[PDB]
Design a protein around this ligand. Structure first.
Ligand SMILES: *[C@@H]1O[C@H](CO)[C@@H](O[C@@H]2O[C@H](CO)[C@@H](O)[C@H](O)[C@H]2NC(C)=O)[C@H](O)[C@H]1NC(C)=O
Ligand SMILES: *[C@@H]1O[C@H](CO)[C@@H](O)[C@H](O)[C@H]1NC(C)=O
Ligand SMILES: *[C@@H]1O[C@H](CO)[C@@H](O)[C@H](O)[C@H]1NC(C)=O
Lengths: 13, 189, 182
């Protein structure tokens, strides 16, 4: 693995 | 500019213990500097940290698919990203440059401070000790503390208040993960 | 912990400024330049061993903006309280006359993440070779920042780091000059 993974943001609605 | 400001922050945190044997993940949401809701992998659900975060806790906890993304994060996100940078973060070792020079507690006095300047090291944990004639001097020691340079190096100054006499040999000793034995620098009056 | 990795983001109104970065034990791995949509590695060598698709940060910042709207209303439009910075000026190495060194201006414990920073040499602004970090997260959820000025030490020149922040009544100046054997 060489690619940093993003942690998604939870959105309120 | 006196217009009011409003700040949202998010911090997705990965905490590692014993390599990647134990890993804890936090999904943290902030309004200004106030954390209002968080997912803790120890729990596996969001919990309101303040009353402000109750709606988000309830709403996000109602979405099982969303929760499963967060529940798997220690593996898919935390352990993964640790692996990605391990070689240049976890294994980064930069040894300190060590200098000793005299100084003054008050500028009009004769030299009565020995400065041990420890520069450019990584990671942060370091031990610096002063010796006079092979005996550790534990009195009169003051330091800047550990200082981040913001560029993946640290420094610290560790000063010994003392009146140098002829013949005396002072030694600054430095221990650090990058070293396999203590680094010593002598100073003579 | 042995180590902590944090993906830290913020979005600020009405400035409409957003930031996205990764932090490892309090140092920055990289951040995304929002305008250029490019990943900026804190140290050059980091980029040879890893990568990050900058596009991912944009999606996160979008959600941050949307959440801010929601929390702003939910709080009854309660604005942030300014917390002015502590400012320290140091060199990165022991100073020797005519030996290249770097002045560091450390700006710490402040919010919101907006400052104007100027280096002054003998009271005049200087920008040659200066550099800076983005806003870095603190565990108390305030911010810190570094500014850098390479210089050649002399008995002639004096320097100041001048910091402006909404929490300050007047600009904060932290001084540096050559120490004379003391
Ligand atoms: C930093 O300085 C800038 C200006 O140099 C301030 O931003 C505003 O700039 C616009 C045009 O560029 C003016 O119309 C505003 O009046 C400025 N705001 C002022 C003067 O308050 C900005 O506020 C400064 N940031 C600080 C001090 O944190
Ligand atoms: C650290 O990890 C090793 C193997 O990964 C394990 O054998 C050891 O018990 C761990 N240390 C602890 C749990 O203190
Ligand atoms: C906002 O106003 C409503 C209406 O009075 C109140 O119920 C709520 O507690 C307020 N929220 C905050 C964060 O002050």
């Amino acid at each position: 693995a060489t690619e940093y993974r993003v942690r998604v943001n939870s959105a309120y609605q | 500019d006196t217009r009011p400001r409003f700040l949202e922050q998010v911090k997705h945190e990965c905490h590692f213990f014993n390599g990647t044997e134990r890993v804890r993940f936090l999904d943290r949401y902030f309004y200004h500097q106030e954390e209002y809701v968080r997912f803790d992998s120890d729990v596996g659900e969001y919990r309101a940290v303040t009353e402000l975060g109750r709606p988000d806790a309830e709403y996000w906890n109602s979405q099982k698919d969303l929760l499963e993304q967060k529940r798997a994060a220690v593996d898919t996100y935390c352990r993964h990203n640790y692996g990605v940078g391990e070689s240049f973060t976890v294994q980064r070792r930069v040894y300190p440059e060590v200098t000793v020079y005299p100084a003054k507690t008050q500028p009009l006095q004769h030299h009565n401070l020995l400065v041990c300047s420890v520069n450019g090291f990584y990671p942060g944990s370091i031990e610096v000790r002063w010796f006079r004639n092979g005996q550790e001097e534990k009195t009169g020691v003051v330091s800047t503390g550990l200082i981040q340079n913001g560029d993946w190096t640290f420094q610290t100054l560790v000063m010994l208040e003392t009146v140098p006499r002829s013949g005396e040999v002072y030694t600054c000793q430095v221990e650090h993960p990058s070293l396999t034995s203590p680094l010593t620098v002598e100073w003579r009056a | 912990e042995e180590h902590v990795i944090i993906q830290a983001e913020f979005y600020l109104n009405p400035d409409q400024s957003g930031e996205f970065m990764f932090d490892f034990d309090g140092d920055e791995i990289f951040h995304v330049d929002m305008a250029k949509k490019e990943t900026v590695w804190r140290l050059e060598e980091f980029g040879r061993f890893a990568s990050f698709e900058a596009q991912g940060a944009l999606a996160n910042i979008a959600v941050d903006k949307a959440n801010l709207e929601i929390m702003t209303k939910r709080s009854n439009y309660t604005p942030i309280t300014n917390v002015p910075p502590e400012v320290t000026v140091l060199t990165n190495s022991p100073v020797e006359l005519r030996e290249p060194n770097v002045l560091i201006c450390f700006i710490d414990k402040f919010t919101p993440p907006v400052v104007n920073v100027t280096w002054l040499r003998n009271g005049k602004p200087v920008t040659t070779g200066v550099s800076e970090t983005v806003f870095l997260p603190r565990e108390d959820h305030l911010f810190r920042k570094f500014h850098y000025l390479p210089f050649l030490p002399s008995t002639e020149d004096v320097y100041d780091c001048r910091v402006e922040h909404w929490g300050l009544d007047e600009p904060l100046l932290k001084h540096w000059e050559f120490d004379t054997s003391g």
